[PDB]
Design a protein around this ligand. Structure first.
Ligand SMILES: CC(=O)SCCNC(=O)CCNC(=O)[C@H](O)C(C)(C)COP(=O)(O)OP(=O)(O)OC[C@H]1O[C@@H](n2cnc3c(N)ncnc32)[C@H](O)[C@@H]1OP(=O)(O)O
Length: 180
């Protein structure tokens, strides 16, 4: 499979999913900083990114988790730029289940980048038999995240009551799955 390269997974001509490396720390930090105000509306971590060392710490932990298959953290490269992150935030090996996460900088939204990334990951991990069940959990009111889940052919399984906390407030989640 020529799309599986040493630097990452080649989705298409424009998109590569990069394996984390410390060299990406600065660009990733600047991307987060540029998107901090908008990101806080949907995710819990951005309020806690204040300096480049927070980016370094994230990369260090991601590399540890990738090494030990606790997670699969990938940096989305669109053309020449890091666009965001797509991940298996949790890999449950015993149950062959992966829980998916994603985010994109504002300047990279509306381009099908995450949908293309997710389709590629499900091909590579699903059709190979490594993962049988893929899961997306997202807050009910998150319009774009719900749209992405459906765009990727996931099926709504239920509503998880008060399951995700942002700023001390618990919100309901939709849980979606794609089963191989
Ligand atoms: C599971 C979780 O992680 S929940 C948390 C999700 N993250 C966040 O909420 C963080 C803040 N938000 C974001 O980062 C983004 O809004 C995301 C990642 C949720 C969605 O970004 P999108 O760019 O909409 O992702 P996606 O890859 O599905 O692209 C679809 C959009 O691109 C357009 N598009 C353009 N080209 C294509 C293409 N080739 N293929 C598919 N769609 C395309 C679609 O029309 C659609 O645009 P629309 O929203 O105007 O209808």
């Amino acid at each position: 499979d020529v799309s599986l390269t040493p630097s990452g997974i080649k989705v298409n001509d424009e998109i590569t999913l990069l394996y984390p490396a410390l060299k990406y720390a600065e660009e990733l930090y600047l991307l987060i900083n540029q998107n901090k105000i908008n990101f806080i509306k949907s995710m819990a971590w951005p309020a806690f990114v204040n300096n480049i060392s927070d980016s370094v710490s994230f990369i260090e932990q991601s590399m540890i988790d990738n090494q030990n298959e606790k997670a699969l953290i990938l940096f989305i490269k669109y053309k020449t730029k890091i666009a965001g992150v797509v991940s298996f935030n949790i890999i449950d090996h015993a149950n062959k289940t992966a829980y998916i996460g994603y985010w994109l900088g504002a300047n990279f939204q509306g381009k099908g980048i995450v949908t293309n990334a997710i389709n590629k990951l499900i091909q590579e991990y699903g059709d190979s038999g490594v993962i049988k069940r893929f899961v997306i959990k997202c807050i009910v009111d998150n319009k774009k995240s719900n749209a992405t889940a459906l765009r990727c052919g996931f099926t709504l399984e239920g509503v998880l009551q008060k399951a995700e906390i942002l700023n001390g407030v618990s919100y309901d989640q939709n849980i979606y799955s794609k089963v191989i």
